[PDB]
């Protein structure tokens, strides 16, 4: 069923720096995709930063991986409308603990 449709995170957020599970940002570019640029989180460490500022292996930094909507080229390299796909992306990182 074909229907019609018209028209970095670091800019406004530095949680990637101040999280106890901090992360880097990867520029994922794809011109055959809309949006063209996706920013993908990569956790910096296995452990999490503790209250002394040190990497602490009593917990783990883990990515939050989410499926999100994008638009791709149904005929490859052909900008004549496109399919609606779902891709798995790391949106950020959180700190998981064994003590719950």
């Amino acid at each position: 069923r074909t229907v019609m449709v018209n028209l970095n995170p670091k800019r406004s957020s530095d949680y990637y720096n101040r999280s106890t599970s901090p992360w880097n940002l990867h520029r994922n570019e794809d011109p055959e995709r809309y949006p063209s640029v996706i920013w993908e989180a990569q956790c910096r460490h296995l452990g999490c930063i503790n209250a002394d500022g040190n990497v602490d292996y009593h917990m783990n930094s883990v990515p939050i991986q989410q499926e999100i909507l994008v638009l791709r080229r149904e005929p490859p390299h052909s900008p004549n409308s496109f399919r609606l796909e779902k891709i798995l992306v790391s949106v950020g990182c959180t700190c998981v603990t064994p003590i719950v």
Partner: single-chain antibody
Amino acid sequence: NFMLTQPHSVSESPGKTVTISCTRSSGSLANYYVQWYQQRPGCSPTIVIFANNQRPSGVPDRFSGSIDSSSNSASLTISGLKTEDEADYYCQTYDPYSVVFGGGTKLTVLGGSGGSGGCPPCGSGGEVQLLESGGGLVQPGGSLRLSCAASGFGFSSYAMSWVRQAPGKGLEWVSAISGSGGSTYYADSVKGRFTISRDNSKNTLYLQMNSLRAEDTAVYYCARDLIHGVTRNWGCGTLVTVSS
């Protein structure tokens, strides 16, 4: 990396308290959580203490754990010993790259009999299910792929690992992988021969075993970890035999 040293065996009378200690050879013990596993003869291991001193539901409160940072050691204490406590107890901890089990301490409850125990279930209880398969007989230099089918939990949220045990011998950590599959870890003797991987859309964990050796013969267990190095649930194992 490091070793964990616990006694080969200990004996104590029923109704008394016994402590089993585990000394870490290198690295600071207080930097990494210590777990303790009970394994009865012929059974899968089961957790009795995780994160130094946490007790899962269903473990009697006569079990407790502690650490002594100055002697670089951890201890399992059993008060009010019952005959069903007779078993092999394994300590386990980790560092950023590897997981290590102690050699296992066989506890004898003096007086002979007056109880039993029984084996745990596969998956260590609850709704957690871990079903291994792929084991078989192979020639040296051969290949085998093991799989572990998981159910009852959000599979992509859990680090997983492979641990093996030759019949009559101790637990030996093999390999580990993060929930997303982006990080993998290997025991030294399997690097370059084994590959751990996972398929999160199929709830499946894999172990590709190339260049198989006679010393690779063992029951191979799938394991669910709360964080890297902290095993919470065990499968029932698949047998791999390597022989000429």
